[PDB]
């Protein structure tokens, strides 16, 4: 069993936070360089996700929904939410996210999941620093990841630019409506 | 029968229109915030449509066109023209598009349909005047519809921000090519 | 047997390109206005492309790649690699992309192909001179081409804003991570 | 309001019954030769609907369904139910399928509905006795139809084969597990 | 780890199965009747799979592939795959076949898979003596599936009938020739 | 230019042909076995296609049409026109289909086209005699074919049984009725 946080503050969770390294899911592509999330606060509590990377130069992304697994509980227990294929999107795609990290600064994050497949180092930095970084792989390591084949996401010196305001930009609106 | 204005002014109706009320189309989301269409005049003198919407916090949107129902008419009975689904936009859907009421400022709009199914209450600012508001209310109800369960639309006190330069950003461009 | 350019500076060649005229392929919009294409070169040394037009006042574009068909020739024949349709992009389609001609200061350049089926006069600017222009035409026929029918693509007098940085809009990530 | 029949013997309704004229929906294939239905009573109570024409040769069909509008009512008020595009079958579309007349062995019957649009006159013989085709057109003008542009349906002189088991041959199965 | 059974007679194993009782994959329609598999070896040594199941009185079925995840193994460890959905089959998806027991007169077999999620126990007839359908399942139970919430699945006193014969009927051979 | 045959008797033509070689269209499976067409005469004179091959064990097949290029004329030159994907049938595609020789029994056919690129020698028998075989080959080397790399078609000793009624299992007369 893991230990995920308690009490996560959900609005200060909300921004932008840049992968620093990652356990890649199966269809995040895996070469990708300026990796990001955007997240924001929905009026109904769910979060907005958008998840960004560069792929040999071009721009790719998905746009997304968090929510709380259990919201009685105060684990930070999340479920995200994806439509795909993005081109297509009537098949909807559920996983865990579990946050069994954060520092009280809001500053970077470790994120995981039961089955100990994928993993995620989140920074507000683009460039963590190096000590915080190797603590918070070790934190994986309490949890039970093999941490052999961990290799740092490509981040250059300045971030590229992108319309990350909250959108629907692939028309899932226009399935929901349907039913 | 309805009573359509007669010559629009189509160059001076383009532009932004905040929708201020709606019975809603079927697949217009039902509970959208900070509503609005675009209107541009495209060479060939048809209109290019860009519907917007705020879903649960999200930008939804559709591209589509506007055009008159008879050219040789002076009345101002329009079709609206839709590829659908936005994600596999293969079936061209149209319906009315008439102006009920426009005043001589060009400042807000009643439109609707011989079904009395759907109605628009339009305005050039997101904040309608109250006695204005209840004026065209009251023609509408001039044409027969039931007005009862005509809810506001909510409006933010400051537009979002979107790109709303004409495009065809799903590609329809590429299927009418094959035809 | 056609005489396209040897070393080609590539890096030189990459930004945005005005049509001046062409041959459209099939699918490029044949009553199109303010044509560009902005290409980018990739990590790998291939080249993104974004083709763009204005068909009746609505920007439709295309993203894809380019590459050499030889990477050991020092000839300018590139390959341009598209997926179709764009709504659905799971069909690759690729076809000859050879540079007939480029000036010393790489500010026009005559595109074709063996077929002389389709044939692109390109220029930095989208006011070309004109004795630049009917030099490249001249070119053309030097090669086999039939200009009897060609003609110059519309240029508004300021070129449209869009987004030109590359990105892949309609998902080919996730088409391309399945295998 | 429209008299539709009360106490319909669904089980005896079912088989298969010929068209022998009709103001065909929008989808319906417009010049049908040979056209048909066959129904069969599901487990649960609903019918599944086999629809079939030959257009210029070659066999359409749309599989669908039908049940009570209202269950508690005695009155042969139906609705149809089709997941469409057939090959791509993720729009449910529904219509009323009225039963305004049937003879008590039930050889012929009248649909129809309120909206007064669409109208059929099935047979379970594909040559329908000429008297009874004239009282049952008749039975129609009662409901308000116009039955001025009705064209009965062409019909062999030997039905063609095709295979009626009730099957989902588009795999709407997939689509409903995902739900 | 599992004991599967080695040296499987796959000549032998061809033909068709009738499923007794299974803990139904996600997408396999999981109140079946008349559930059966047929399959058949293919030239190349592969087995071409057609599972069927009526849902509702309607014939569903889906078409794949079957075959040894490692060759040089004696072990009865298969993989199948499918391309999903069936009505756009670009996805390709495959999970673990693994024969647990098969008695020596191939007439009753009990597959399974590592993860213990679903399980199938499959007979040439459609109605299995009880004594050896309580065998099997005692069978599972020693590999560590909890068999509390098995149902056996309906099978009718005949079965029906249907078209059998290996088909691409999707067409994924023309998405196979594309690459 | 190519000597195709004057005054097709295409009643006659119509009927079941073995492919006994050929230089496969780009989509049509490369390494076929068994491969026929079916051509049925529709009613407004165009001609119903039914191709079919086995790849692999398994039944794939295309449906379509054949019609005369130049009605007019008494050439044998025919176009045939498919829609692509089979399982998404959007895209129309169309070739040349010209018949280079038939004898005067409507006993064997050679299938040809100016690009020189495909190639089909037909049979009514699935075991053609060899002299008349290299006879076909042969006229197609005065045609300008370099016939070096043609393989024949495997046949079996009997053709597997398949339906081959005229049909449009994949729904485009959907997709035709919107326009
Ligand atoms: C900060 C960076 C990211 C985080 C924290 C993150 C997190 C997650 C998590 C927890 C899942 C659930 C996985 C599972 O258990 O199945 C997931 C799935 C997914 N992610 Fe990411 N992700 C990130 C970046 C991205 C990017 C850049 C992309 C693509 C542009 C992407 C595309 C997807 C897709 C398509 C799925 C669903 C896959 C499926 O259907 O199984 N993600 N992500
Ligand atoms: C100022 C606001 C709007 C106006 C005046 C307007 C007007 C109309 C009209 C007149 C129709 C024809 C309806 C019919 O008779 O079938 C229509 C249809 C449609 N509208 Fe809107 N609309 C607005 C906002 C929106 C928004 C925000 C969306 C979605 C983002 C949207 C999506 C659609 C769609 C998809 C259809 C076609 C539905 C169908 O196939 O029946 N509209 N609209
Ligand atoms: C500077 C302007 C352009 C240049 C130099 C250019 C060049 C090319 C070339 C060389 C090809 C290969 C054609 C072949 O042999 O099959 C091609 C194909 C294609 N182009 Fe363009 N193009 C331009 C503008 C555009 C635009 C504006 C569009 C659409 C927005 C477009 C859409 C396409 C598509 C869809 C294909 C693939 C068509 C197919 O599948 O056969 N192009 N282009
Ligand atoms: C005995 C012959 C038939 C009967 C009694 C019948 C009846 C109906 C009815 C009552 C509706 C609802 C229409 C509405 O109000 O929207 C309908 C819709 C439909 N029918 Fe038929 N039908 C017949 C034949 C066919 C055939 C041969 C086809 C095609 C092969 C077909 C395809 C469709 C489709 C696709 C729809 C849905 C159209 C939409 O989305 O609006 N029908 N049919
Ligand atoms: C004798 C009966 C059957 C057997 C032994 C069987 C076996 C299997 C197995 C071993 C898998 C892999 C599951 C995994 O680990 O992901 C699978 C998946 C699948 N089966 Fe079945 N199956 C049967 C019946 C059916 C039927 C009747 C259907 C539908 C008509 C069906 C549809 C599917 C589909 C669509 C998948 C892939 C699901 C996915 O993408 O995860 N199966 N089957
Ligand atoms: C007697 C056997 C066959 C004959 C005479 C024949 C003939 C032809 C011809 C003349 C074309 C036009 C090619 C072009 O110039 O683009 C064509 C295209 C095509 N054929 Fe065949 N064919 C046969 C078998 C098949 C089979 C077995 C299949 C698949 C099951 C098939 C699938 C296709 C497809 C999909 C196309 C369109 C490809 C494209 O979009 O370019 N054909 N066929």
Chains 1, 2, 3, 4, 5, 6 share one sequence.
Not at 36 to 60: C, F, M, Q
Not at 120 to 125: M, V
Request: no cysteine; charged share 25%.
């Amino acid at each position: 069993e893991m230990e995920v946080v308690k009490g996560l503050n959900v609005e200060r969770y909300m921004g932008r936070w840049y992968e620093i390294a990652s356990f890649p899911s199966r269809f995040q592509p895996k070469n990708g360089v300026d990796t990001r999330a955007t997240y924001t606060l929905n009026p109904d509590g769910t979060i907005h996700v958008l998840n960004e990377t560069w792929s040999n130069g071009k721009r790719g992304f998905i746009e997304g929904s968090a929510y709380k697994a259990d919201p009685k509980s105060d684990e930070a227990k999340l479920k995200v939410k994806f439509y795909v294929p993005p081109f297509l999107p009537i098949i909807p795609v559920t996983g865990d996210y579990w946050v069994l990290y954060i520092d009280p600064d809001y500053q970077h994050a470790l994120i995981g999941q039961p089955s100990r497949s994928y993993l995620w180092i989140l920074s507000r930095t683009a460039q963590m620093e190096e000590e915080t970084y190797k603590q918070l792989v070790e934190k994986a390591v309490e949890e039970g990841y093999d941490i052999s084949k961990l290799h740092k996401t490509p981040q250059s010196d300045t971030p590229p630019e992108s319309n990350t305001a909250p959108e629907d930009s692939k028309g899932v609106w226009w399935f929901k409506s349907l039913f």
